[PDB]
Structure 1
Amino acid sequence: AVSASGKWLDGIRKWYYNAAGFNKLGLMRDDTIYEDEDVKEAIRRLPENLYNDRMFRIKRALDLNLKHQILPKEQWTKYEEENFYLEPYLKEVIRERKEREEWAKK
């Protein structure tokens, strides 16, 4: 609930965001998430163009990892640049699982 200290939180989140290396590979935040079955169904529900963008950026990341190189500095993902595309879908899936479970315990 902090104010300016919350801006400080934005600062440390930005620094930690640059501490994570996926920006070096062009990845969006959501590409990095571990793909358990909930995430699997979450990816299944993605719109085709977005799913294509995801698969291609994943290939670009793996390909850069092949030759142990790095994406050029101009092309790095920026902290404000990201679109958190997978969140609504994954939240729908997880909420559905929690609903099925809460029904299942009764």
Structure 2
Amino acid sequence: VSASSRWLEGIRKWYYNAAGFNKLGLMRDDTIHENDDVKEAIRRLPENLYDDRVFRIKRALDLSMRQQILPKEQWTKYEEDKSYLEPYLKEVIRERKEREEWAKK
């Protein structure tokens, strides 16, 4: 814990707000590029997460079309941003790499 760690956190909170997806109600993970690994992790989500992710992205695509955004008090507050897809994505990558590694010998 540092005075400057809050600075890095501050630069991050800064970028987050700048990046802007939160105004559309998205979560960081709702905006990842879909690739094989990402597709597989999307597959592994439990019903509720998957359903929630669908509703989110629908809400954004909808906003994006009207070119609006959500009232400020409903934006995704950084730090309340749940990294719901990382653990799966991370696990999918691990197993791919194990394969990749087996293919060398």
- Report if TM-score (shorter chain) is over 0.5: yes
Listed as ranges, the gaps of 5+ residues in structure 1 are none
The residue aligned with 1:99 is: 98
Query: Following the alignment from structure 2 to structure 1, what is the Cα–Cα distance between the partners of residues 98 and 13?
Result: 34
Query: Following the alignment from structure 2 to structure 1, what is the Cα–Cα distance between the partners of residues 75 and 4?
Result: 28
Listed as ranges, the gaps of 5+ residues in structure 2 are none
Deviation per CA, 1:9-58, whole angstroms, max 9, x where unpaired?
Answer: 00000001101110110001100000001000000000001100000100
Secondary structure at the residue paired with 2:4? Answer: helix
Kindly state the Cα deviation for residue 7 of structure 1 after the two structures are TM-superposed. Answer: 1.6
The residue aligned with 2:63 is: 64
Aligned residues: 105
The reply on whether 1:38 has 2:42 as its aligned counterpart is no
Which TM-score applies when normalising by structure 1?
Answer: 0.95
Deviates more, 1:54-63 or 1:3-12: 3-12
| Aligned partner letter, 1:25 | L
The alignment's C-alpha RMSD in Å is 1.1
Query: How much identity, in percent, do the aligned residues show?
Result: 86
Which TM-score applies when normalising by structure 2?
Answer: 0.96
- Map 1:1-106 to 2 at 5 A: 3-106=2-105
Structure 1: 4+ residue segments shifted above 3 A: none
